[PDB]
Design an enzyme around this catalytic site. Structure first.
Site, short mmCIF file in Angstrom:
data_model
loop_
_atom_site.label_atom_id
_atom_site.label_comp_id
_atom_site.label_asym_id
_atom_site.label_seq_id
_atom_site.Cartn_x
_atom_site.Cartn_y
_atom_site.Cartn_z
N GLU A 23 47.80 41.64 53.78
CA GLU A 23 47.79 43.07 53.52
C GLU A 23 49.12 43.52 52.94
O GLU A 23 50.18 42.99 53.30
CB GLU A 23 47.48 43.84 54.80
CG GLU A 23 46.97 45.25 54.57
CD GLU A 23 47.42 46.20 55.66
OE1 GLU A 23 46.72 47.22 55.88
OE2 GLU A 23 48.46 45.94 56.28
N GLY B 145 47.84 50.58 63.99
CA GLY B 145 49.00 50.08 63.27
C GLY B 145 48.75 48.70 62.71
O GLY B 145 47.63 48.36 62.32
N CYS C 193 44.16 52.46 55.44
CA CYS C 193 43.83 51.21 56.12
C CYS C 193 42.60 50.55 55.50
O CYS C 193 42.56 49.33 55.35
CB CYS C 193 43.60 51.47 57.61
SG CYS C 193 44.99 52.26 58.45
N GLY D 79 50.24 45.33 67.42
CA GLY D 79 49.12 45.46 68.33
C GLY D 79 48.96 44.27 69.25
O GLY D 79 48.67 44.42 70.44
N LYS E 246 52.41 59.78 70.77
CA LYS E 246 53.67 59.32 70.18
C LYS E 246 53.47 59.11 68.68
O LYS E 246 52.91 58.07 68.28
CB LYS E 246 54.14 58.03 70.84
CG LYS E 246 55.39 57.43 70.21
CD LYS E 246 55.92 56.28 71.04
CE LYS E 246 56.76 55.34 70.20
NZ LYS E 246 57.90 56.05 69.55
N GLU F 236 43.22 49.31 66.59
CA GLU F 236 42.79 49.53 65.21
C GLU F 236 43.89 49.00 64.31
O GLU F 236 44.96 49.62 64.20
CB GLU F 236 42.50 51.00 64.95
CG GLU F 236 42.51 51.40 63.48
CD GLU F 236 41.17 51.20 62.80
OE1 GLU F 236 40.14 51.32 63.49
OE2 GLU F 236 41.16 50.94 61.58
#
Lengths: 484, 483, 80, 80, 81, 81
Positions: free
Chosen positions: A390, A233, A289, A238, A180, A255
């Protein structure tokens, strides 16, 4: 205008209800193509296709050497679409052409390397010469077997690369995957599915569904016939996907994002350190990331480092992704641009000093586009929110320290553990600093050094599990102990 | 048994299971299908310290005991220590800069060069040095008709156990597989190649397959092998391809229609013999085409983004030798000294472009050969000067050095002027030695240039040339200029 | 004999006025590493050669300049 | 000496420099870092440069000169 | 050993013939796992081929403890678990 | 679900319904002994207990009587005895 279709059961089909949506180029805000919008019925169809391909297909039954030939054909047909994949990636995700022209080659090389390692060196059967039990004589050995149906969710950061990673890790070990892609960037997964169809991969092994909203993702995560979820993501999504998958007890690998720190010691070469810091912070507009958005600079070299960093940052060119002269492109969407602007405003409010950037950029000859200037913040304390949260944008904060122990303490003072970097003129000192960092990957005198056999992953709240190498391949197999 | 397996797997738990049977084979056949974390055959509750245990499905995940159990309680950290600590040392960081030069490479040349009059008998001692006693000669029909492989076989005497002459021009994966099978059935432990570049590359692939087993398509990678392969001795019969000292082998993939690569320092031939007998009888067309191919190698190596002073010295010496000795060979076909000089120039040009890498000209020549079966030498020769003019402005003082090597006087001139003079000298030599100069002579249609240019961008030789190729629109221009 | 040509052996040059002996075999297997900041490459070169315990050999004059200290720091744990 | 196959050692009990000559004593690798020669004084610089020039010129003239050695010697002479 | 066996039998209901081996089994497991960790576990592992030719250097894997662990055990086999 | 809120590593070992399969060529004495042991060790409170006993139709009648006798031969008493 091009039209794209879902890839289900080894063929391209429309959605059950026939709905479609339009993708848009972030570089000029023009429509690119129309993609079919998968519903819950299409997700169910993909799940049943993968389940049948695993339970009754020939893919899990054939030997690793037999899978290797099919993977080689897949890699060849992937190489055959390099220019199309690069162009689609540049137009859809905003990757500059100099960066996006290597995606097909990298994916094919990864496929071939992992297939060769699986067929030649992976321990599919392992002996246990000493079981520790003298009352049960016999032969003990370990069989490793595919898990089953895997679901791979990828973000918009690196669509082609992440799709290649998920597909290779899933299908090389014998599993069947339902992929996806992100809502913003669905084209590259479908183009790779074209090569999968051309190579003669058995039907149901690879399925790609694209859909807006989050009903499809919830259906994929909560379905009883899905055995494993591999998600990449943000931390918030998550942590919810893990809660959803907890109800059926299925394996989950997460992750998540990071706030990686880049450490410059006083003995580092200033030219190389400045170049590496600029690269590791502003590659792909800071949307990687593992971006080193926290720049730890020693007090003994702060004044000399800051001017060179400012000049190097102002030397960067922002332009259209398809122009080979461009170094930076646009952000993935307007919402991302608004988030970056909000974080910049917050940093200004907190008292940080704005060195460069902090404003939108108008690319000449182009109307529209989500362009932002690279931004540097100085006089930043490590407990400021901008140093703790972030951003996913071309914003960096510079924090000064006085000793290696203080630098280690500052670097470890975060909730993320994805990656890090150390620049120094001595390997021993750099390794002493690196062995204390609580991050999944440390680069010494380098950054973004990707590798096929180099595992990567996150500590703490950056997720768990690894990708690439034997460590990455072991996530997609079960362990069975057989005693005779 | 199938019904029993279906019943056993018909549950939401996958913790353990057991099978009781009088046959180990039948019990294991039943056990390999059970979806449980532990299977006991003719036993139960057989606990172990190094035997992992755990559950499938809704019985949980993860394992205990053994290395599998111990791995659950440790993190994995990847540490990378960069080999260089300077600006511009990594090609990846060149994306965010206008300078694209990447001069940081490591140089090596372990091939043992044997050359001179009557140096062929040295292969008998070279076989003893390498520790081999069963060599198989790899060649083709054209070379085998000239009798040179017979000379090699007589030199090897008792160390030769077979000859394989079925290698075709523009070899493929199946040719490599057949040659490897023939070499294996003869019990070979060393490979001797007598022929052109295709034979030498096929022999490199055959050595890799013989050492590692499997098929040729399995080993098509870059820098993957970690240990020396089967020993290889290369005996070129053309006055230049450079393949006897390079680390790359190009093989056609007929199922894909694309030339694939294997690149590794461990596939470099262990030794080579430069005997002038193997090129004394070469015709005029082959001589001029191979000499121009070597010249193209040397000139491109002197201009690429990875040029180094050692490669510059090799390229300049090769250019000087070719320029001095090609007219002597053309006028005086069996002049032995000039043939030896051409062989040495070819070897040094191979050394040069092994490290400096080729540019756009070979990217074009590979597509020309793959689509229209055009030989490598003619394609390289006809595009060398047009590529030189294409790169005349982004190439620095290198082209002035090349012109000085060719003999054109450059006591004072602008870099553009010296670069143009170098191409003028190259064209002068080409016209002096009877060299074809246009693509129309060899049957390529005008309209297929678009497809050829599109196929050109897929090669790996791009991004090594001095001028970055913006797209197929410039490959179109160069191809049209070559017509 | 490895060669079958006139002048291939230095011993036979006693009975001739020509003393040239051009028949030699060339080899250069040394791995050359060069450039700015190329010293850290010794850490990987040690792994390539399969060695873990290196001893630095030098003299007083060079040791006074501090270069062996740089080599030791580059080797890190491979220097004993 | 970083790429040659010969080592010269003095024999104090004989007062004569003895030789060991073997392709297997060639160093496996070498590092050409400019830091190791940046601080070299003037006298050492000129003497070593002239020693290299003497090597290149003598190699171009000896009885065993070969075109590969000629190319190496000429490139070295030009660079010096 | 005797105290552990008696307490296990009185608390969890294990028969003495089963519970008399718990301390010996636990000690043997401790010694075996400690020996394997000290001698054979790959605490440091090399990566000879990283798959990246544009980033030369030494790549290797370090394995480190996670941190604070919480272990919850049921009433089935208290001492063993 | 509780540990999901902080993203921490979780290893789960849950119960089972393990099946014990007896094929038609199995030795009936050993098969009966193993089935009885694997089902009734520690009163069936082991996680890996073979509570599902799959028996082939070709040996069902002979297996059932021996299993019944072996099960009735078991003694239930105080743990410390």
């Amino acid at each position: 205008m091009d039209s794209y279709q879902l890839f289900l059961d080894g063929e391209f089909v429309d959605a059950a209800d026939g709905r479609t949506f339009t993708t848009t180029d972030p570089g000029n805000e023009q429509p690119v193509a129309t993609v079919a919008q998968a519903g819950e019925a299409d997700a169910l169809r993909a799940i049943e296709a993968a389940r049948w391909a695993f339970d009754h297909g020939e893919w899990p039954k054939m030997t690793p050497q037999e899978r290797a030939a099919r993977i080689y054909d897949f890699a060849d047909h992937v190489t055959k679409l390099a220019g199309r994949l690069a162009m689609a990636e540049s137009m859809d995700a905003g990757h500059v052409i100099n960066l996006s022209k290597f995606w097909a080659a990298n994916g094919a090389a990864l496929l071939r390397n992992l297939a060769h390692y699986s067929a030649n060196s992976f321990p599919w059967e392992e002996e246990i010469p000493y079981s520790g039990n003298v009352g049960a004589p016999g032969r003990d050995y370990i069989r490793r077997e595919p898990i089953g149906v895997c679901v791979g969710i990828i973000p918009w950061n690196f669509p082609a690369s992440m799709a290649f990673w998920k597909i290779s890790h899933a299908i090389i070990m014998g599993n069947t995957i339902v992929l996806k892609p992100a809502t913003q960037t669905p084209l590259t997964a479908l183009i790779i599915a074209e090569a999968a169809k051309a190579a003669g991969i058995p039907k149901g092994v690879i399925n790609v569904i694209t859909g807006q909203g989050r009903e499809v993702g919830n259906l994929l995560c909560t379905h009883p016939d899905v055995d494993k979820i591999s998600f990449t993501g943000s931390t918030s999504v998550g942590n919810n996907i893990m809660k959803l998958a907890a109800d059926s007890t299925k394996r989950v690998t997460l992750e998540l994002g990071g706030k990686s720190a880049n450490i410059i010691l006083d003995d580092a070469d200033l030219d190389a350190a400045v170049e590496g810091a600029v690269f590791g912070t502003f590659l792909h507009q800071g949307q990687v990331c593992e971006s080193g958005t926290r720049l730890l600079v020693s007090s003994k070299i702060y004044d000399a480092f800051i001017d060179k960093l400012k000049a190097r940052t102002e030397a960067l060119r922002v332009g259209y992704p398809l122009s080979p002269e461009s170094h930076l492109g646009p952000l993935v969407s307007g919402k991302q641009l608004e988030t970056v602007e909000g974080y910049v405003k917050l940093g200004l409010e907190e008292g940080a000093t704005l060195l460069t950037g902090g404003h939108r950029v108008e690319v000449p000859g182009i109307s529209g586009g989500h362009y932002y200037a690279p931004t540097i913040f100085t006089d930043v304390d490590n407990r400021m929110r901008i140093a703790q949260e972030e951003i996913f944008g071309p914003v960096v904060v510079v924090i000064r320290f006085d000793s290696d122990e203080e630098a280690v303490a500052i670097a470890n003072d975060s909730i993320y553990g994805l990656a890090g970097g150390v620049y120094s003129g001595s390997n021993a000192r750099a390794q002493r600093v690196a062995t204390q960092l609580r991050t999944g990957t440390v680069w010494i005198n380098n950054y973004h050094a990707f590798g096929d056999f180099c595992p990567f992953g996150g500590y703490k709240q950056s997720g768990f599990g690894r990708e690439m190498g034997a460590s990455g391949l072991s996530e997609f197999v079960q362990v069975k102990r057989v005693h005779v | 048994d199938e019904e029993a397996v279906a019943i056993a797997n018909d549950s939401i738990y996958g913790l353990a299971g057991g099978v009781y049977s009088g046959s180990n084979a039948r019990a294991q056949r039943v056990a390999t299908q059970l979806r449980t974390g532990t299977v006991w055959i003719n036993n139960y509750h057989a606990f172990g310290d190094f035997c992992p245990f755990g559950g499938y499905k809704q019985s949980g995940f993860g394992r205990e005991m053994g290395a599998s159990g111990l791995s659950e309680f440790v993190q994995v950290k990847r540490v990378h220590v960069s080999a260089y600590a300077s600006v511009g040392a990594s090609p990846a960081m060149a994306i965010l800069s206008d300078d694209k030069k990447t001069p940081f490479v490591q140089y090596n040349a372990p091939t043992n060069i044997i050359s001179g009059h009557g140096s062929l008998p040295a292969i008998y001692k070279e076989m003893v040095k390498l520790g081999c006693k069963r060599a198989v000669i790899m060649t083709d029909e054209g070379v085998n008709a000239t009798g040179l492989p017979t000379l090699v076989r007589e030199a090897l005497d008792d160390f030769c156990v077979g000859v394989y002459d079925r290698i075709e021009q523009d070899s493929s994966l199946d040719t490599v597989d057949a040659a490897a099978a023939y070499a294996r059935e003869c019990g070979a432990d060393a490979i001797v190649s007598v022929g052109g570049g295709s034979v030498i590359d096929t022999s490199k692939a055959v050595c890799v397959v013989l050492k590692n087993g499997g098929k040729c398509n399995d080993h098509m990678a870059m820098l993957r092998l970690q240990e020396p392969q089967t020993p290889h001795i290369a005996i070129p019969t053309t006055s230049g391809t450079g393949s006897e000292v390079t680390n790359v082998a190009v093989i056609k993939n007929k199922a894909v229609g694309r030339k694939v690569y294997i690149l590794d320092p461990h596939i470099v031939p262990n030794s080579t013999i430069l005997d002038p007998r193997f090129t004394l009888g070469l015709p005029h067309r082959m001589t001029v085409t191979t000499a121009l191919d070597a010249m193209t190698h040397s000139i491109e190596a002197l201009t690429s983004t990875r040029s180094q002073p050692i490669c510059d010295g090799q390229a300049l010496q090769a250019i000087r030798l070719i320029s001095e000795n090609l007219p002597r060979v053309v006028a005086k076909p069996h002049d032995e000294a000039a043939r030896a000089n051409l062989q040495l120039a070819a070897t040094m040009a191979g050394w040069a472009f092994n490290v400096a890498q080729v540019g756009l000209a070979h990217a074009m020549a590979h597509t020309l050969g793959a689509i229209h079966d055009i030989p490598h030498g003619l394609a390289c020769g006809i595009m060398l000067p047009r590529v030189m003019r294409f790169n005349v402005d982004h190439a620095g003082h290198k082209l002035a050095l090349a012109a000085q090597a060719l003999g054109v006087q450059t006591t004072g001139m602008d870099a553009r002027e010296a670069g143009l003079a170098a191409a003028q000298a190259v064209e002068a030599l080409m016209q002096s030695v009877d060299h074809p100069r246009y693509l129309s002579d060899l049957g390529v249609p005008r309209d297929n240039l678009s497809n050829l240019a599109a196929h050109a961008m897929g090669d790996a030789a791009i991004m090594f040339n001095a001028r970055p190729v913006k797209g197929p629109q410039e490959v179109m221009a160069v191809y049209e200029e070559a017509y």
